[PDB]
Design a binder for this molecule. Structure first.
Ligand SMILES: CCCCC/C=C\C[C@@H](O)/C=C/C=C/C=C\[C@@H](O)CCCC(=O)O
Length: 142
């Protein structure tokens, strides 16, 4: 059984903005290597850390949450997401990145993820991605 948290709430899916999450699956071929989103004080400020290519980089995004929907902004760049699946204990979740041809991402806790729940997120990402190639950004010499 892989029934997640219902109704899906983005604030609950991110452990109420108290835990760091890592990008582990993505249908976007330009997905950031070793991407990790973590709390950056206090809308909801988020610090994104990633690699491009050998050197580490970091940017400050501002999240605006409303139910399952998540709007992230950096300067004048805007990205819209919807948390389409969240596991029982908020250990992982799957986002639909809203654009002309939507992408799907799997995010999981940087530390303390329950295997059965993480596997349910992997299956939900497989279902939504279907045959589209799934990048594993956390396996890029992180
Ligand atoms: C209070 C801490 C919150 C941590 C939660 C992190 C990710 C959740 C996940 O569902 C949402 C991800 C949103 C990503 C938004 C933008 C990224 O594409 C930016 C990548 C880095 C960049 O290119 O600058």
């Amino acid at each position: 059984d892989c029934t997640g948290s219902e109704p899906v709430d983005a604030f609950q899916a991110f452990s109420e903005g108290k835990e760091a999450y890592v990008l582990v699956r993505s249908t976007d071929p330009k997905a950031r290597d070793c991407l990790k989103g973590e709390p950056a004080g206090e809308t909801l400020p988020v610090m994104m850390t990633f690699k491009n290519g050998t050197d580490w980089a970091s940017t400050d995004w501002t999240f605006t949450l409303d139910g399952a929907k998540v709007t992230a902004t950096l300067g004048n760049l805007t990205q819209n997401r919807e948390v389409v699946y969240d596991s029982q204990s908020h250990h992982c979740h799957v986002d639909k990145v809203e654009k002309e041809v939507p992408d799907y991402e799997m995010w999981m806790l940087d530390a303390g993820g329950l295997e059965v729940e993480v596997e349910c997120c992997r299956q939900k990402l497989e279902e939504l991605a279907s045959g589209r190639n799934q990048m594993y950004p956390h396996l890029k010499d992180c």
